[PDB]
Ligand binder design. Structure first.
Ligand SMILES: Nc1ncnc2c1ncn2[C@@H]1O[C@H](COP(=O)(O)OP(=O)(O)OP(=O)(O)O)[C@@H](O)[C@H]1O
Ligand SMILES: [Mg+2]
Length: 370
């Protein structure tokens, strides 16, 4: 009927209630609630977080008209495993492969410390020979085999993340690693060539790489928005708060493009005085940090041995609202670089990318298995 996804982020818990249309999703209600209950993408104070999630589920339950009781929880690429696996189910009759055989054969893969959370198909193989993308309505005589991609997350995260959302009085129908979700924000062309999604939130920066249409591998960095603000507060000798504002109001991640005529005033933290800075001044600190962030990204890529990103670079997430971000990355790499923002209205901010893709993934599996 209705699709409701929940994004439990370090800056704000995000919720989206949507409806499936022929050419996409129709957001009919959203909610957002800032919280200090989540840090580095994990629950820092259960109670505080459990209250943020409820508030978010409410603000949306109101704005959407729907009375939310079921939700799809996204999971951060943290303590996550992305590997290859296959499985085959047998037949004793002439069976017309339907959505239920897909699930049955995938379930086997969903099989110690971790737990398979997502199993997605790469290619199926009917009666031990017909290699095909879709095996539906095709007739199987002896067997249906699937070579899939699998994602596992550490049991500690899964459990508590769900214990917290379910403590709000709603059921978690399913879970979706952002490592799978980002596939949505891409284009078929990007997925094919080898695109790299860079989601810079507040505490975490997630990196996902897709090639030939499927996810290849993923990881995260504990450096993001907050660190930009931290760098700003120290550089202008000011409070975190005012630092978090001038970043929003005047932030520019590329030095060579920040204004001088643009001036603002920040108060000092050690005196009852006030200093005046230009946008460019602020830029020095911002670019520096956003750069160190991309340098981390590259390393993640090297570790995962995922060089070559002919698919290009896609950057998103809250910090993606920063000006000059596209400029800076393009200046330190040689592939296309775009800042993905949800198309649907109401959620036309980079920070909503993950939440909306969670719904996409939901719907995607809904069809695959029916
Ligand atoms: N307009 C702005 N300019 C630059 N940065 C901003 C702006 N708006 C949002 N941010 C920053 O983006 C970050 C939050 O965005 P985001 O929602 O993607 O993080 P989160 O998902 O809630 O937590 P997580 O780090 O676990 O992903 C904050 O650090 C915030 O300061
Ligand atoms: Mg986030």
């Amino acid at each position: 009927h209705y699709y409701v996804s929940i994004d439990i982020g370090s800056s704000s818990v995000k919720t989206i209630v949507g409806e499936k249309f022929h050419n996409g999703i129709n957001v009919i209600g959203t909610g957002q609630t800032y919280t200090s209950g989540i840090k580095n993408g994990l629950i820092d104070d259960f109670d505080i977080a459990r209250q943020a999630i409820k508030d978010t589920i409410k603000k949306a339950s109101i704005a959407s008209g729907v009375d939310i009781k079921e939700v799809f929880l996204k999971l951060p690429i943290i303590g996550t495993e992305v590997y290859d696996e296959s499985n085959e189910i047998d037949f004793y009759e002439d069976t017309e492969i339907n959505g239920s055989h897909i699930e049955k054969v995938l379930e086997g893969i969903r099989e110690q410390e971790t737990e398979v959370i997502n199993v997605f198909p790469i290619r199926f193989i009917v009666d031990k020979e017909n290699e095909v993308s879709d095996p539906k309505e095709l007739i199987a005589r002896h067997s249906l085999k699937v070579e899939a991609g699998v994602i596992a997350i550490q049991k500690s995260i899964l459990i508590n993340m769900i214990k917290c959302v379910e403590a709000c009085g709603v059921d978690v129908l399913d879970v979706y690693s952002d490592a799978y979700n980002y596939g949505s924000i891409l284009t078929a062309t990007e997925k094919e060539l080898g695109a790299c999604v860079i989601d810079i939130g507040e505490d975490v920066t997630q990196v996902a790489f897709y090639e030939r249409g499927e996810l290849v591998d993923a990881d995260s960095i504990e450096m993001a928005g907050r660190d930009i603000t931290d760098d700003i507060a120290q550089g202008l000798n000011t409070s975190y708060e005012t630092a978090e504002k001038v970043k929003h109001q005047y932030g520019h991640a590329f030095y060579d493009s920040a204004s001088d005529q643009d001036i603002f005033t920040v108060e000092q933290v050690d005196s009852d005085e006030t200093v005046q800075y230009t946008q460019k001044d602020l830029s020095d600190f911002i670019e520096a940090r956003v750069e160190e962030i991309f340098f981390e990204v590259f390393d993640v890529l090297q570790d995962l041995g995922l060089t070559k990103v002919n698919g290009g670079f896609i950057v998103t997430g809250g910090s993606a609202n920063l000006l000059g971000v596209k400029e800076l990355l393009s200046d330190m790499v040689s592939e296309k670089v775009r800042i993905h923002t949800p198309s649907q209205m109401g959620i036309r901010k980079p920070e909503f990318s993950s939440a909306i893709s969670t719904i996409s993934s939901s719907i995607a599996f809904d069809e695959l298995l029916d």
